[PDB]
């Protein structure tokens, strides 16, 4: 029954080692709900937990929706309410996790009060989880969701461009995700290609000065930008 903050952080680290990410998420949610600021280590534990949880739900939703799209093809058997029902079950569950993350960010984490790196981290997180909602949104609500993700990413972009150098991994990661948003969600392949090209080129013009430790995190994200650019432009 050890439900103080330090114990919750401890149990989240244990849940990570045990690959129990739903448990890790609930320990991190409880830690956030204590009302104190998260450290850089603690922010990562929160992100890792929920990224793994939604990762599995998104992967599942993609499988089910792909089967559902095959069953609605012209000239197929086109019968079976089971795929739709079960795709809806997974989808509702996925939406619940995004709404939980977004609620924590708005009620406890995103403050005007915060440091640059931490504000960017949380606002990027707000854009990501609205992007995940947009992946499954088909209704009248799709535009509201897409707009909410753009505002979060744009607000995060403004802070990173003002306070961070172009080689910063948080800044690089944000720009990568926002370009994925442009391509996949906003249906703006030109904006996506442009952002990714600009981000990679600006960071490349500064690699020379980077310390040994920073070089690894930055070049990792830069390879992700390069891979997307190869895929999107076809080179």
């Amino acid at each position: 029954p050890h439900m103080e903050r330090a114990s919750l952080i401890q149990k989240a680290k244990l849940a990570e080692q045990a690959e129990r990410y739903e448990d890790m998420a609930a320990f991190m949610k409880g830690a956030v709900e204590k009302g104190e600021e998260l450290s850089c280590e603690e922010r990562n534990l929160l992100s890792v937990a929920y990224k793994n949880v939604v990762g599995g739900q998104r992967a599942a939703w993609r499988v089910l929706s792909s089967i559902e799209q095959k069953s609605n093809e012209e000239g197929s058997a086109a019968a079976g309410p089971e795929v739709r029902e079960y795709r809806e079950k997974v989808e509702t569950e996925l939406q619940g996790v995004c709404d939980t993350v977004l609620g924590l960010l708005d009620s406890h984490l995103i403050k005007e009060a915060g440091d640059a790196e931490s504000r960017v981290f949380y606002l990027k997180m707000k854009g990501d989880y609205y992007r995940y909602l947009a992946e499954v949104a088909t209704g009248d609500d799709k535009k509201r969701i897409i707009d909410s993700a753009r505002s979060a990413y744009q607000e995060a972009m403004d802070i990173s461009k003002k306070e961070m150098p172009p080689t910063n991994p948080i800044r690089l990661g944000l720009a990568l995700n926002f370009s994925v948003f442009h391509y996949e969600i906003a249906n703006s392949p030109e904006e996506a290609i442009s952002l990714a090209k600009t981000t990679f080129d600006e960071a490349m013009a500064d690699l020379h000065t980077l310390s040994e430790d920073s070089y690894k995190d930055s070049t990792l994200i830069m390879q992700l930008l390069r891979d997307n650019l190869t895929l999107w432009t076809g080179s």
């Binding site: 990224k51 995700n177 391509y183 992700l224 997307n228 895929l231 999107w232």
Partner: peptide, 7 residues
């Protein structure tokens, strides 16, 4: 072959 985002 699928677009990379974070991690």
């Amino acid at each position: 072959l699928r677009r990379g985002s974070t991690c």
